TrEMBL record, chains A, B:
Keywords: ATP-binding, Metal-binding, Nucleotide-binding
Binding site for ADP 4: 165, 208-209
Residues the entry annotates as binding ATP: 138, 165, 179, 205, 207-210, 268
Residues the entry annotates as binding ADP 3: 165, 179, 205, 207-210
Binding site for ADP 1: 165, 204-205, 207-209
Keyword Nucleotide-binding among UniProt keywords: yes
Domain Bacterial type II secretion system protein E, chain residue ranges per copy: 69-343
Encoding gene per record: cpaF
Binding site for Mg(2+): 209, 233, 278
Homology family: Belongs to the GSP E family.
UniProt protein name: CpaF
Residues of the full protein shown: 80 to 501 of 501
GO molecular function, one term: ATP hydrolysis activity
Binding site for ADP 2: 165, 179, 205, 207-210, 352
């Protein structure tokens, strides 16, 4: 059909007629109306017109290209779409029905794709270009975006969009999915109930956010909780929860409110527990204060592949925080602050499981000595490729946080769970 | 004689006839239709004695020079011409039958050659100039292009086309060169398929990268593959491959993005498989996580003479990563990640062969226990000094990856190849 060729010719004529700079002062609807006027002018110049509905569709396509997210607009609007992948202007894939598929959709040129990516990542004030060719960002519409610039992506800019889904699991789901043994369920319930400084470290795809939500589920209703998170991922059912969200900087590089500022404030809001959506910067240091300067029971999500790795991440983050903290001082602070680390990882089969429940015991020389309470042991692969394994307790009768369990009257529960966990 | 002068005059007239925008916007056929008429009118005005076929040839040459690839185009269209090498406007070489021969065809001047180079690299959206004197690209057709600007090339641009040599390095190439016995070839075909993690270790000059490219050919087309390389060399026929590259820092020591960052981001890019051109530093850690966290079937080359040395090198690379992992944790990670190792070596005679195909069996105490599926036993030498050897199957009929082949149904082929090798 000539619809594609005619649309391309009309787009070229519009480009030769006006420039995007003339529409940067208009809103989405005002820009669309101005583009419709420009399209009428271009049709008059070229004396080419067609069906009114088809002309309106072409005008909408032109608006999307000029101001929207390009040919991605018809795709993002869909719901059966799981993920969108772009490997250059000439190829795009979509995850439908849980499987990848190549679509006929296409871009015009790599520069157009780069501009679209710049728009998408600037929606949250971030910029991807030759200076910072690698970018990861969050679409507050409920998705995650990755972009690589041409200097790294040899075949032009590469883009990936991953959409949301309301997982919102509960501990029953984890128990039934074998992510944690029922004895582990009791142990974790005790740990959460009795205000134990807790860090939920996990690898990519481990769903550590869901684990954090189900952990917070145990918090006593009477405790005033203030949650800091870069998005609204968490959803607590307590009656006295304060929900805060960081504000990404505008394009002018102003108005930013980073995790560090939110945690610093929360220190001054009289919270019974400070809960961080994800530790990703210097805020860790401030968070650690919240774990020891009273406020016992604070939690925090972290990206790491193992408890020792997570401790290393925390130490490195505090170090890069700009403070001249002596190395041993950071280790002492971590040892005195954290009371438990929970490791969540995705095994080769793709299932999420709580590999480690560990408690920081102390500091020896310059190494943080920790003892594992629960560990997941793998034993083989089944017929359908599923990983086979079981949770076993190290048998430690009295973990370091035992005192807190005594204070909250949970000695019996903790002892039972630890003993029967074998 | 007079044909050249008439063509030059017609080219000048066409260049002065209309702005470059009109030619650029017009389609190749659309522009050529008017260009032929313009050339015919110019010839008639000049009243140059020429034939209708000669007129068509002149029109085609004018189109090629003005908007095409100039005198280089006829070489491109040919099939026998595998590689083309222009050492400035006055020297053109072609690789035919594996031999390099100079050809009389030469460009008008270095300026025309630079223009043609820019046009060629524009297809992929890349642009070369005195500010970016070096350019490399892989055109959609699959032919590679390397271009250098005059400020570096002290005798004019150095265009280099390398057309797609399909089936150049497929497994048949290794088998017929005695780099691997046919049974080893079948086993490798099963191993690349079946999505088994690999680490292609090899000594100096063992052709690790060539073997890796051969292995990747077994990937299922639908699998989304991401390749990280220090320098872009790999080329995968698979239709859904994403290519990356590490950017070194400026001389000031800033702006670098090393392999670690690319591998980390690969986890965010939702890849079915991740391929690392060469593992040398901390990235060995991150890569293993990809091998361990559901991105099975990943691959990565390594510099080691024997599988045991390869595993020792992986341990050292992880340890130098700066993370405070204990030795047992690193060994457990390795044994859980790398299913199979291939040790390729350059023998004393200079031949290249796959010395070992081994499978990481387990971890006992503090030692990684491995078994060799295939071993190249040396037996002597010929009067020419060539080394003689045979690929021997160790007789391990059930490698621990056997169950995965059962999942993919390759159990029959695996057992047959293992038993028939002797």
């Amino acid at each position: 059909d000539y619809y594609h060729a005619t649309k391309t010719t009309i787009f070229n004529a519009l480009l030769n007629t006006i420039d995007l700079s003339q529409l940067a002062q208009l809103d989405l609807k005002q820009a669309g109306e101005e583009i419709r006027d420009i399209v009428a002018e271009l049709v008059a110049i070229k004396n080419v017109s067609m069906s009114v509905a088809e002309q309106e569709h072409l005008v909408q396509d032109i608006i999307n290209d000029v101001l929207g997210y390009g040919p991605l607009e018809p795709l993002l609007a869909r719901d059966d779409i799981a993920d969108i992948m772009v490997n250059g202007a000439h190829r795009v894939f979509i995850e439908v029905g849980g499987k990848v598929q190549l679509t006929n959709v296409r871009f015009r040129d790599n520069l157009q794709l780069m501009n679209i990516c710049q728009r998408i990542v600037s929606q949250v004030g971030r910029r991807v270009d030759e200076s910072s060719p690698i970018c990861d960002a969050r679409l507050p519409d409920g998705s995650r975006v990755n972009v690589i610039a041409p200097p790294l992506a040899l075949d032009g800019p590469t883009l990936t969009i991953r959409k949301f889904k309301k997982d919102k699991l509960t501990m029953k789901n984890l128990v039934e999915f074998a992510s944690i043994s029922p004895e582990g369920a009791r142990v974790l319930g005790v740990i959460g109930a009795c205000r134990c400084n807790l860090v939920i470290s996990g690898g990519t795809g481990s769903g550590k956010t869901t684990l954090l939500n189900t952990m917070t589920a145990f918090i006593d209703p009477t405790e005033r909780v203030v949650t800091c998170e870069d998005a609204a991922e968490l959803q607590l059912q307590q009656p006295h929860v304060v929900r805060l969200e960081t504000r990404p900087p505008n394009l002018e590089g102003s108005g930013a409110v980073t995790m560090r500022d939110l945690v610093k404030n929360c220190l001054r809001m009289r919270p019974e527990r400070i809960i961080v959506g994800e530790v990703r910067g210097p805020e860790a240091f401030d968070l650690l204060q919240a774990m020891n300067t009273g406020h016992d029971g604070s939690m925090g999500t972290l990206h790491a592949n193992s408890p020792r790795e997570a401790i290393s991440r925390i130490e490195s983050m505090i170090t890069m925080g700009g403070y001249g903290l002596p190395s041993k001082t950071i280790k002492e602070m971590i040892v005195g602050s954290v009371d438990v680390i929970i490791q969540a990882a995705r095994l080769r089969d793709g299932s999420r499981r709580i590999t480690h429940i560990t408690e920081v015991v102390g500091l020896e020389g310059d190494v943080i000595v920790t003892q594992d309470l629960f560990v997941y042991e793998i034993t083989g692969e089944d017929e359908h490729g599923k990983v086979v394994g079981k949770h076993r307790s190290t048998g430690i009768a009295r973990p370091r946080f035992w005192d807190r369990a005594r204070y909250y009257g949970l000695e019996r529960e903790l002892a039972e769970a630890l003993d029967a966990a074998e």
